[PDB]
Structure formats: structure tokens, C-alpha cells
Amino acid sequence: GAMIESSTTIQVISAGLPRTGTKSLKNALEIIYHKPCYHMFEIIFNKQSDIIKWQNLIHDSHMITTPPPLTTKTIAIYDKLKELLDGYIATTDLPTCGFYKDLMNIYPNAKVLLTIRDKYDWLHSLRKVVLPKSNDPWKLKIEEGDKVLGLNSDFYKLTEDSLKFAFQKDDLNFDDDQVLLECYDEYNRLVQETVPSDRLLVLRLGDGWEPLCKFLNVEIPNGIDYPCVNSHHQMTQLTEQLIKYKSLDAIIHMFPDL
Ligand SMILES: OCc1ccc(NC[C@@]2(Cc3ccc(C(F)(F)F)cc3)CCN(Cc3c[nH]c4ccccc34)C2)c(N(O)O)c1
Numbered sequence: 001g002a003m004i005e006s007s008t009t010i011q012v013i014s015a016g017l018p019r020t021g022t023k024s025l026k027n028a029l030e031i032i033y034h035k036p037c038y039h040m041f042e043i044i045f046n047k048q049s050d051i052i053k054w055q056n057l058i059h060d061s062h063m064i065t066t067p068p069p070l071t072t073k074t075i076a077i078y079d080k081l082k083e084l085l086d087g088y089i090a091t092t093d094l095p096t097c098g099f100y101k102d103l104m105n106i107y108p109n110a111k112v113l114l115t116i117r118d119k120y121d122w123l124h125s126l127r128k129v130v131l132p133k134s135n136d137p138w139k140l141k142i143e144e145g146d147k148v149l150g151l152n153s154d155f156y157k158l159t160e161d162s163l164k165f166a167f168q169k170d171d172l173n174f175d176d177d178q179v180l181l182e183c184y185d186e187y188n189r190l191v192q193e194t195v196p197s198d199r200l201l202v203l204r205l206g207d208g209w210e211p212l213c214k215f216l217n218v219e220i221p222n223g224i225d226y227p228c229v230n231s232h233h234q235m236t237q238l239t240e241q242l243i244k245y246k247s248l249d250a251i252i253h254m255f256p257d258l
């Protein structure tokens, strides 16, 4: 196809929850658009100063009166969300995913993606990387590796609060598998009920380029396979290597598509 000059603004809002292929999708969107896509990894590796800004936004988010129409407080919240996303062409993962409805209002010409998978596969992956149970010895390893990356209790607070925001829960028993599974199903159902079907593409793991590129009116990237990255096995290796070497920069060449 012809090469066209794309606008550097949010063009794709991904509502999929963590551990549903968000990092592969982030990489795929960057391959298509040649501009950055937001993701929790963007916070960890490039924008740790944003943690407090996202926390402030979530703290104020209960004051969002759903447009139409737009109220004054909603403008202030929407302005900070637009500021956080300046320079990006897409959003994936926490903390953004729970803001899908607000992002749809801020970027009325953006399209929405929802990545889904088997709920028990999702929970297993979540417990190995994002939310280990409080009695799991692996949790102490994750925390040791996280300190190497400079992540403190405020980072864990952001993950917890952005998950609570996505699930629309005032509190959440993070150690309760039944609660998490029910929240997962209700969240994915709600996205499909809320977003007009014309504006939504539901993606399953393994779907690859073709449905995504058709939805976005772009050519399939020539000679580039669809990304497959961020397996729990790979995250376990990363944690162990951070513990062993005590720095990101000593191991970063071992993890190419991070
Ligand atoms: O790809 C989607 C996606 C992948 C991972 C995460 N987070 C996993 C975590 C951050 C992390 C660490 C290392 C790396 C790496 F890759 F550099 F190694 C990446 C990310 C989140 C925090 N910690 C668990 C924890 C330990 N004690 C807690 C107490 C309360 C709550 C959580 C925790 C690992 C998210 N989040 O958090 O949205 C999204």
C-alpha cells in the first residue's frame, strides 16, 4: 500500500486486562504506527514519574459523571488523562484499560480493542506475574526483583487501585480467585455491552495480524511475525536474572523485545 502521514494521537484504545497479550499488542501497534504505545512497561522503564499522576487521576476518577454531557470536573480529569497520553498513538494494559469509556470520549476517532483469553489461563498467568497470593513464596522473589527496577509500595498501590478501578470495586480481596474470575468475566462482558460493535474488535490470543490490520485499514507488516512476548516463563526468568545481577542494565541485552 501507499505510505500516508498518520496523526500522533491516540488511535487505538485497548481495553484488555493485564495478561491477555497486552505487551505483544503494544509491540504490534508500535510496528504499525511507528510511534509509542502506552503500557505498564512504559511506566516502569520510561515514566516512573507518572505513577503519582496516575494515582492522582484514579483518586479523582469517582467524580467522572459519564458524558454526554461534559461537566467541569470531568474536563479537569480528561485534561490530565490527555496530558499523560501526549505523544502516544495507543493505550494498552493497566492503568489505562479501566479508562476505556473516558478515552473513547476524549479521542472520538479512536477505535477500541478487547483482548480476551480462557479465564483460568488468565488467572494462572496473573498469579505468576501481577498478583501472587500473599502466602506464595514466589511473591517475595517478585518483590526483590521489583526493587532492582526502583519499584516501591506506590507502584503496587497503582496496580491495585487501577485494577479496582477497572473492576469498579471499592475494595477487592486480591487473594480470592473466585472474586478475580468473576470480575474478569464481568469486565469483558461490560466492554462488549458498552462499546458499539462498529468501534470494537475482540481479539483472542493467537489471532495475529490479519483481523487487527483489517480493522485499522493498514497493510500487514511485511516480513514481521506478530509479536509473542511476556510469557509467565519469560517473566520468571527476568525476575531471577534481576535478583542475580542486581541491575536492569546488566541483563537488558538478554531480553530483546522488552
Ligand atoms: O504486561 C502486562 C503486565 C505485566 C506485569 C505487570 N505487573 C507485574 C508487577 C510489576 C512488574 C515487575 C517486573 C516487570 C519486569 F518485566 F520488568 F520484570 C514488569 C512488571 C506488578 C507488581 N509486581 C507483583 C507484586 C508483588 N507484590 C505486590 C503487591 C501488590 C500488588 C502486586 C504485587 C510485579 C502489569 N501491571 O502491574 O499492570 C502488567
Ligand SMILES: Nc1ncnc2c1ncn2[C@@H]1O[C@H](COP(=O)(O)O)[C@@H](OP(=O)(O)O)[C@H]1O
Residues within 6 Å of the ligand: 017, 018, 019, 020, 021, 022, 023, 024, 121, 125, 205, 206, 226, 227, 228, 229, 230, 231, 232, 233
Ligand atoms: N502472540 C501470542 N500468542 C499467544 N499468546 C500470547 C501471544 N502474545 C502474548 N501471549 C500471552 O499473553 C500473556 C502476556 O500478556 P500481557 O502482555 O498482557 O501480560 C502471556 O500468557 P502466559 O503468561 O499464560 O504465557 C503470553 O504468553
